[PDB]
Structure formats: C-alpha cells, structure tokens
Design a protein around this ligand. Sequence first.
Ligand SMILES: NC(=O)c1ccc[n+]([C@@H]2O[C@H](COP(=O)([O-])OP(=O)(O)OC[C@H]3O[C@@H](n4cnc5c(N)ncnc54)[C@H](OP(=O)(O)O)[C@@H]3O)[C@@H](O)[C@H]2O)c1
Ligand SMILES: NC(=O)c1ccc[n+]([C@@H]2O[C@H](COP(=O)([O-])OP(=O)(O)OC[C@H]3O[C@@H](n4cnc5c(N)ncnc54)[C@H](OP(=O)(O)O)[C@@H]3O)[C@@H](O)[C@H]2O)c1
Lengths: 639, 639
Amino acid sequence: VGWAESLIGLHLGKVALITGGSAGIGGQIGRLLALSGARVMLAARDRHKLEQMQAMIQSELAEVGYTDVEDRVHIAPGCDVSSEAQLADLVERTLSAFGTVDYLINNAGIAGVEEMVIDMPVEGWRHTLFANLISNYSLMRKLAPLMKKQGSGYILNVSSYFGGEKDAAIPYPNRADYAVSKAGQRAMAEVFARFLGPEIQINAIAPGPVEGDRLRGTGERPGLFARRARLILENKRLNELHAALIAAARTDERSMHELVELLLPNDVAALEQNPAAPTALRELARRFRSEGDPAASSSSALLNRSIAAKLLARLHNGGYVLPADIFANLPNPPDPFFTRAQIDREARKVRDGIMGMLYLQRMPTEFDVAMATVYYLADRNVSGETFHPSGGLRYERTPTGGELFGLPSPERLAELVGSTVYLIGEHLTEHLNLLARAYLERYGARQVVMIVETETGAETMRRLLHDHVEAGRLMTIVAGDQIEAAIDQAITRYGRPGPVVCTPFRPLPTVPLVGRKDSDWSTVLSEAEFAELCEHQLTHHFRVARKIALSDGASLALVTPETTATSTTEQFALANFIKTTLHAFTATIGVESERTAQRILINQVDLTRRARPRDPHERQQELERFIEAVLLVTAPLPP
Amino acid sequence: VGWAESLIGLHLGKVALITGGSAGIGGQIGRLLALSGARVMLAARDRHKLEQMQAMIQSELAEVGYTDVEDRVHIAPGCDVSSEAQLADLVERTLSAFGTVDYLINNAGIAGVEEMVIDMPVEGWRHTLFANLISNYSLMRKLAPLMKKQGSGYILNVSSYFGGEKDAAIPYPNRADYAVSKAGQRAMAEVFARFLGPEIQINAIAPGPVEGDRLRGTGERPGLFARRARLILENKRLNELHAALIAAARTDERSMHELVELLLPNDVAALEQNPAAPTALRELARRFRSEGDPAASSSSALLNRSIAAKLLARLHNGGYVLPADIFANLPNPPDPFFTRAQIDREARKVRDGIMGMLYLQRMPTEFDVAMATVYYLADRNVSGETFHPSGGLRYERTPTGGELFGLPSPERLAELVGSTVYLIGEHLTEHLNLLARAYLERYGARQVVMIVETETGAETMRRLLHDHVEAGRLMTIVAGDQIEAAIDQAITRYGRPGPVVCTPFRPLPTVPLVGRKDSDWSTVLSEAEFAELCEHQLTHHFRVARKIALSDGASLALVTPETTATSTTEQFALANFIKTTLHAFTATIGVESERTAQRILINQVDLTRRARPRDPHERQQELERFIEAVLLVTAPLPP
Ligand SMILES: NC(=O)c1ccc[n+]([C@@H]2O[C@H](COP(=O)([O-])OP(=O)(O)OC[C@H]3O[C@@H](n4cnc5c(N)ncnc54)[C@H](OP(=O)(O)O)[C@@H]3O)[C@@H](O)[C@H]2O)c1
Ligand SMILES: NC(=O)c1ccc[n+]([C@@H]2O[C@H](COP(=O)([O-])OP(=O)(O)OC[C@H]3O[C@@H](n4cnc5c(N)ncnc54)[C@H](OP(=O)(O)O)[C@@H]3O)[C@@H](O)[C@H]2O)c1
C-alpha cells in the first residue's frame, strides 16, 4: 500500500467543488480529494487545461483501483469566477452532476492589477474583488442552503499570509487589490462561522509562498517573481521621474506642462547637460546614466511609451494641466529597455529575500500544501479559523485595534489653525456635524468642505451646520457616484486639504446572513448585495485614497462603519468584516505612500469597538473619543 | 484496510517523546503516533496508568500487524515535569531506549492553583510555571542539540485557546497561572522558530474545550467543570463577605478585628437581626438567607473553616491587623455546605455556556484532537505558528500592541496633585528618574516611593534624584527578594499609592538561544536561566499585582522589558516572549479585579515596539512616549 493509501476513504462520500482547479494548488487539492474518495468538480476558464487535469486524475484514480472514474472527476470550462452569470451556471452544472456539494473550495485567486494604488485603475480593483472575494460569497450563498438542509457542509477560502491575521495587518505593496481580497476571504470565515454553525464549517487557509508556476513561471510567461522584478525597475523609473518633476515644480516658475516638455527629446545625456533644465531633472538624468546598465536603453533614454502614459495619468490625477497628446511624438527607445541582466538580478533578489524571510528557508510544493489542506478538511471540529499549511515568516505586521489614546500634542493642534478640511460622508450626520464644528470652532480651521453623496444629504448637513454655512466656513459639494470629480471641484474652488476624513456614504444593510434550515434563503444577503457592501464600504475608501495620495500635505483618515445599540448582530458582523478587510488596504497604501514623492499620511479609524449606550453622556463620550481619534491622525506633524 | 491504515507509514522512522502520555489528549497522541509508525516514549507520574496505556497501545499495534511491539512503546514513570531532575532522567532514559528524538510533544499541562490572583500562593504560581512552561524549554534545550545535529526535528507545545492569540489576549479568570503558562507555550513557538529553523520546526496547538475526563471528570474525582462550579459558589461567599467587611469598615469606627468578630457566631439569622452589626453585614446575611438553598448550611452559616482562612489571608495581605487564631473557635457548619443541587446547577450552567460559545456547538473527543495533531505533525513546511485542531469560540479577546496614543485629559491629570506614587525597578534608571520627575515636578504629586532591589540601586536613584531626596519628596526602600514586605513598609510609612509603576528589576540576558550545529550548546540559555527569566520578568509582576490589587485606589502599570539599539536579536526575541506571556496575566487579573471589592486598575505598558536610535532627540521622544503611556493608565478617573 503506497502513499495514496493514507488517503483512501478520507473523504469518501463527499462532493467537492474546486475553483481554479485545473492547475496550481487547486489542481492538487482536486487531485488529492479525488484520491481520498471524493467526487470533484474542477472549474476554471481554459477547457484544454481542465481536460488535461481531468485525464491525469482519472488515470491516477484507476491506477489506485477506483472504477467508473469518469463519474468521479468532472470539469466546468469557461468559468471565470469574476462573472456572476458563470458562477450561477457552475452551481447548476455541479448540482446536476453530483447533487449536493459538501466542500466548497474557493481556491481561484487572480494576481490582480499589480500596480501602486495611485496607478491602479478603479475598474481593475473592482475586477480583483469580484474574482477573488465577491465570488467566494456568491458560491457560498448558492451552496450553503443545501448544505444546511442536509445538516453538514464545509466552506474553505484559500487566502494568503498577505491577507494579514485576525488582529494584525501585513502590507503588500503594489498588490492592494489582491491583499484586500485575501483579507476579505479570511474575514468572511471569521465573522460568518457563528451564523453558519453548527451545520457548516467555514475556515480559511493562508499558505506562505509556494513553489510552482505562479511564483516561478514557465518557459513562456514570467512568474510572479520575474514580473515583480521588472515592475521594480519600471516603477523605479516612474517614481523617480514623477518625484523629480514635482520637486522641480516647487522652485521653477514654468508650468508642469513646460517641465514635461523638457523630457520630450527622451535623451538622458542631453537632459543632464541642458543648462535650461531645472537641476532636479539634471541630477536625475545624471543618476540614470550613473546607475544604469549601458546595454539598457533606459540608461540613455528617459522614458518609454508605457511609463510615459503612467506618468501622465498621475499628473492629470493630481490636478496638473497637460494635453493628452503631449507624449504622442516621443521617440521610442530601442529594445531592451531593461536588459535580462537587470531583470534577472532583480528577480534573484526577490526570491532570495523571500527565502530569507521563511524560518524554514524552504517553500512547500503545491502537492505539499494540498496534502496538508486535505488532511485539514477531515477535521470536523474547528470553524472560524485560518489554518497556515505552510509559512512562518519574518514579515513586519501592524497590530490593529488599539483601544487607548488621547489627544495629539498642543503643537500639532496649533498647526490646524487656518487649515482646509475635507469631510466625506452622508449617513453619519452626527459624526459629520461634530467633526466639522470641532475643526472650525475648537481648532480654528479656515474652512470645511463637506462632500456628500446626494442633494438630500447636502441639505441635511447645511441645516445641521446652518451657522457655519452662513459665515462661509462650511461648503457642501454633491459627489453622487463621481467622488474623484467632486474632490477635483473642492481642490479648484477651495484649495488643497490638510485633514481629510473619509466616512462611508451608506449604512450597513440589515438583512440576515444565513437562512433558516427549511427556508428558501430569499431574504438572506444576496450576491449583488454583497458586491454592494464591498462597493460602499471598501471601494469607496479606495477611490478617495487613490486621489488624495496625490494631494501634497493631506492627512487622510479612513473611517469604517458604526454600530450602536440599535445595530443588529448581523451589522456587528459586517462591520467587523469591513474593519479587517480595509486594514489590509490601509497598511498597504501606507507603505506605498512612503515611496511616493508626496508626503501624505493615511490612517484608519474604526467606529465599531468589536465589543457590543448608557445615557447620552456615554454616547457623547463615544463620539468625543471618535473626534480625538480623528484628530490624532489628521493634525499635521510640525517639521 | 481500516481507519488506522490512513496512518500506516505516516511517521515511520520517527522517535517521539510525549509528556502527560498516559491519559487524555497526550495518551491519544502517543497511541496515534505509534499506529503511524513512530516509536514513542510516554512520560507521566503514575506507573500503573502508564503501564495500562502501554499495554493498550502495544496490543493495538499487534492487531494492525506490527511485530516486536515492546520496542515501539516505552514508558517513563515517576516523571513529574515540574522537577528538572526528572526531566534530565527522562531525556537520558529516552535517548538510551531509542537514540535521537525527532518529535518532542510538550503535552503535560496541570490545571494549576485555580484561585483568583489575590488568593493564589506565590509558590503555587511558580509550580504551575515549572510544570507547564519552564519544562517545555527544559526538554527543548536537552533535545534540540541532537535534532539540529541530525538536520531535523519537531517541537510541539500543547497550549490552549486560553493562552490567547498572537496579537490578542483572552482572560481566564481564576486561572492566571495556567493562562500565563499556556500563553508562554505559544510565545516560545513564535519567537524561537527563526532561531531553530531551518532544521527544527516549533509550533503550538491550541485546542478549544475537549470532551474527556479533564473537563467531564470520572466516577471518583470531579472534572474541571464541577470544580469550577463549586469554586463559583465558594468564591461567591468569600468575595461577598470580603466586600461587605471592607464596606462596613468605610463607615464604622470599629476595627476590622472587631468587625470580623461579629462573624464568630457563624449564624446567618443572628447576624441579620443583630442591631449592633453594621448594615452592610446585615444586608449580606439577609442576602445569604434569601438566595440560599435551605438544605445547604451555607444558607444558615456564614463561613466554613476553609473560606475563613482565605478571608483572613486577604485581610492580612491588605494590611489589616487581626490575630492568626481569630477563627480557631469558629463553629463548623454541618455537611453539605453547598448541596449537590446547587453544585450540579452551577456545573450545568458552566457546560452550557461553553457549548454556546462554540460556533459548532460540539466538542471534539481526545481522539479527534490527537488525530488532527498527528496529521499536522506530517506537515514539514510550517514553523512558528499556533494550529487550532478544534475551536471557534465567541469569547472576547483584548487586542494587544496598540501603537498610537496621547496624554490623558487635563481632568484626570489634575487628580494627580497630592498623590502618592510608587515606582518599582532597578535596571531602568533613566525611565525611573524621568517618571519620578514627571510625577513630582510636572503634575504635583506629593511624593514618590522608589522601591529598588539592592542598596546599590538605591544609591544610584538617590544620586539621580538628589534634589527630590533632599526636599523629602523621593523615598527609597530596598526590597531584595521580599517585595511584598517592601510594599507593606511603603504603605505603613508613606501611605497608600495612587499610581504604581512596576518595572523589572533585572535586564534581559545576553546569551544565545540556539547553538551552532556542531557545538555542545554550553553557552546557550540554560534551563535554570530560563526559570530565572520567568522569575524576574513574570513572577516579579505577579507578586506586585497580587499585593497591589488589595490596595484601594491604586492604579497599576506593569512594564515589560526595554530593547534599544544596543540590544541583541536574542533580547528582542525574549522581550517579545515576555510581552505576549504577561498580557495573559494582565488581561486575566483585570477581569478578576472587576469582581473584587477593591477599585483597582491594572494595565500593561510595553517598552519594546517589536519593530527593531536616531540622535538623543528620538531617544528623549521614545522615553516621553513611555511617560505618556504610563500617565494614560495611572491618572485616576474622576467620579
Ligand atoms: N502561489 C502561492 O505562493 C500562494 C501563496 C498564498 C496563497 N495562494 C493562493 O492560492 C490560490 C491558488 O494559487 P495558485 O498558486 O495555485 O494560483 P495559479 O497557479 O495562478 O492558479 C491557476 C489556476 O487558477 C485558474 N484561474 C486563473 N484565473 C481564473 C479566473 N478568473 N477564474 C477561474 N479560474 C481561474 C487557472 O485556470 P484558467 O487560467 O484556465 O482559468 C488555473 O486553473 C490563490 O487563491 C492564491 O491567492 C497562493
Ligand atoms: N482538555 C481540554 O479541554 C484542553 C483544552 C485545551 C488545551 N488542553 C491542553 O492539553 C494538554 C493535555 O490535556 P488533557 O485534557 O489531556 O489533560 P489531562 O487529561 O489532565 O492529562 C492527564 C495526563 O497528564 C499527566 N500528568 C498530570 N500531571 C502531571 C505532571 N505534573 N507531570 C507529568 N505528567 C502529568 C497524567 O498522568 P499522571 O497524573 O500519572 O502524571 C496523565 O498522563 C494540557 O497541556 C492542556 O493544557 C486541554
């Protein structure tokens, strides 16, 4: 009896659905579940790879002695998990093949946009959330009614170390969309376990780095390490150019338009020697020539067309005026822009740092991780947890949820005199009133710009703040679903902000999170409502942070939802879900912002104490602690 | 092929040592490791139970088809893990039987003292640390040199949910010694993994509540639930008596001596009707008669001899003067003091609450936990982690390591005027100087009592604080290893404290935590040095907290070790070990203190930011943040 005999019978009688099941970790989970007696459905996009994994597993089952192997491994091609229609067709296909699903393995996880937040299109961020997070809720919502009806089920989200930990965030620079989606997979397990129990287990796994094609690549496409290496070099050029232009603009009278025109020759030596160029650009050109590889055209040309478009988008998004065609006639540098020597050097440094982080100084294989996971899936007695099948890393984490604090120093508070404050929100009218009055009346801010969602919320705040509106100290802008343009309007008409307090427009929903055993679940939080929760409680803050991180001098506070004595226990859960998931965003953009030209601070203030009222005195002291917390992170630090 | 065939070969070639291996979870781990091919040594105290487990396992191995089963299961009787001499004999016995140990399963875990901190003898606390925590380091220190020499090994500490989580404490009222030992088992794994890798894995497991004799009991001895139930009733009587006497003393001119004499008739109805008794004691007697079971003598008698001795010890330890024989002639109430109906009612409430905490509303068996653990032990790719083989609980956790804070309000600071401050410490002379001067010069405290360890430390602080010593504002007491008597001296001579800041006497050691592969490890932190670390960095704070929790009006800050730019990476690790382990103490005594008559606040201030210097300005701002942090938790809250 060989190694697969430790598996025989382990999951006999189980039906498992594995997304991303045609390769990688999910391929090996589907393989090993099938060897252990489960009937499996493998879902992914490319038909050919699914058929090759299906034939490999079926062949292996027969070697072990199973009969009718065609009934034990099924495939669902064309299934992009980011498409809800496909997820509905997946469930229909799986139930018709096998009946009720016991194990939902939410394994598919796209790498995402792989850009800094400030270069990350809003739609790409949405696509990552749909593929990696919203799909996990969508499949659970479709399969959990059947699991609960039969009395048993298991939902397993494949998260990551870069989704953080129960009480600590871990930044993942250039991967904020991925990190947030990973963190949300874990938070789903932590907050939904109490509702899904006793019948249904829900846990996450969070592997450390895994040896396979995703990290290492193949003979055709570069893996995560090589892509990260080239991006290190690309973004080094973009960040250095962007930073130098911002600095040069600080002490040159020419416009950003005219400074960018100095780059049009795209000639490194000609810019170093151009006596009419500001010295920040000439020292940059000297730097490119000194540190660069003489065989790379990046060492003799400033830009390529792709980096030029990223630069222009940053300048446009940070309020500068330049024609869209400014880079149309830019000479194209001859290939290669960075050589293989540069890229491979950076790739080896990426892998060597990661191996140095691991306590064990070795990565598991995809087979190793799947094996640990398939043993873990036999444990009937744990729910709400994150299992680490590999790992142990020296990465720096940021503890979340510190409870005690006071006011900032008198020195930092005096710097608020004369400042411009942006407040963003709609639902939390009492917080918004109190904050505006604290900035204007207590700390001598010049003005507050109150950015709301609707005209009705505008009128609510104008009424609450009627005296400051009349004195011209409180301005209201109606953002709708165009918050970027509203921030542009504030900047143009009232000036750049110091403090920016970003509260959600919308409250949390008040619907059930699970259905009664014999119900149709029709009142339970729907798939589209979960996408809406993400839009209003995550994407909202991301969009504001994306713009405000280009606004020099701003200090940004991201405020997560409130829960009161009125709030249902489902609202408490969803607030804790959002807290944990957003902390992954906040920690990540914090690290990226240190590398940006712009001095901007980004912090998170949580209104829900995760504790779950006694007289309006305790109410007014809970709100006063909120004011203190916001001031603690929006008062500037005197240089 | 049956269920044990999923185990055949899983740990073939491994030698495992399981402490507490004759029953419970450790018995099942030893059983299941032996079925999976490992040779096992089972260690525990009682010879008979070890022989019965050995014969059961050997018999089962033979049923499965192993030969020479006598070579596969060995026992080590007489091994109390709290005795270092026994641990040395255990290792010698195991190496001679099997050669090198691959798996150290630190499973033995005594329940401990099972009292509130204020009723917990210092020696019992020490015994729990020796049995449950110091023994884990001791066996690792003896076995890790051989594991590292052969290139592989595994250390598994059996911790608990009530050891908390990486970044959050979980209180365990009446079990502070056990909770601290559990938390230290986890912290050992988290901080030692980077040093023990790549050759040696070290993780913890933390089961939730487990179905077996430990929780449920047997037909002879009561299990954890029944003991907890009786203790609920006993301690309810003790706490209520203690509280009423303290209150009665607040408004009666008689001494505590004379008030306690009112209890000597031990007659509930006679005290309710005694017109000479203070009303707090008469309302207590009325309460005992109203809520009590008429069949329990607790409803007609005030005390028994055991509760009387606990009461007297609390009064003596809180500074009151009473003769040791005051309860010598106390009439003994006839059995039963609490009936079976009362105790069983409380036991059912204990079990029902626990089952309601579990998301899954069911406990694993000892077999289930061992099975999950034995699968986990095959995972070669994770170190430094805590695996939860069962669990998912609704318990409230306290996040640790919040980073941002300011000063407390002006209102709380003004209440420091005229206060008496106790500072405890020796090594941290700069912190102690700065704190004393902040209390005396900035906030108008009446006086500081500086409690040091040695005459040399006394003279150091007298020199640093020479002006305040001359003005009579700074008093020094030399505690030696008698910190309780030193606190008694402060109280008698200078008055009760408001703020009490407890810093460690000793710095952290500067020795290696692991040895080079071919070394003898003789310079590595020794077994006795690890016990010393616990004495100086845990037991120190516990002893102070034990006394100060009886001092009305005190606010206690427990300060964990400092790490600077000088500090080695081993010191950084040991500081993080102590931080995590002490937070379990701080969170637990905080909950017990809410139930004590005495209004005392207990908080923890961590000097090591777990981050790992730029000019004395950053130094003076790091120390100023320490001052702010200490003030934030020692300034009283105005009523
Ligand atoms: N690799 C690591 O080091 C690591 C570490 C921690 C966590 N994880 C997590 O582990 C999970 C699996 O990772 P992996 O390394 O196995 O990734 P991978 O190798 O890139 O996954 C490949 C599989 O995912 C499928 N897939 C890709 N995009 C998809 C989409 N939009 N819809 C449906 N299926 C899709 C692929 O098939 P098609 O392309 O044909 O659709 C293929 O079946 C992920 O959730 C990842 O976040 C990985
Ligand atoms: N039970 C739970 O719900 C639970 C939950 C979480 C964690 N845990 C942890 O799991 C571990 C095992 O727990 P358990 O429920 O199996 O405990 P248990 O049933 O009380 O353990 C009994 C075993 O421990 C031995 N033992 C007791 N005191 C000892 C000492 N001073 N030295 C050496 N051996 C000793 C006993 O033999 P002798 O009496 O003959 O020495 C017997 O072999 C413990 O570390 C515990 O903290 C338990």
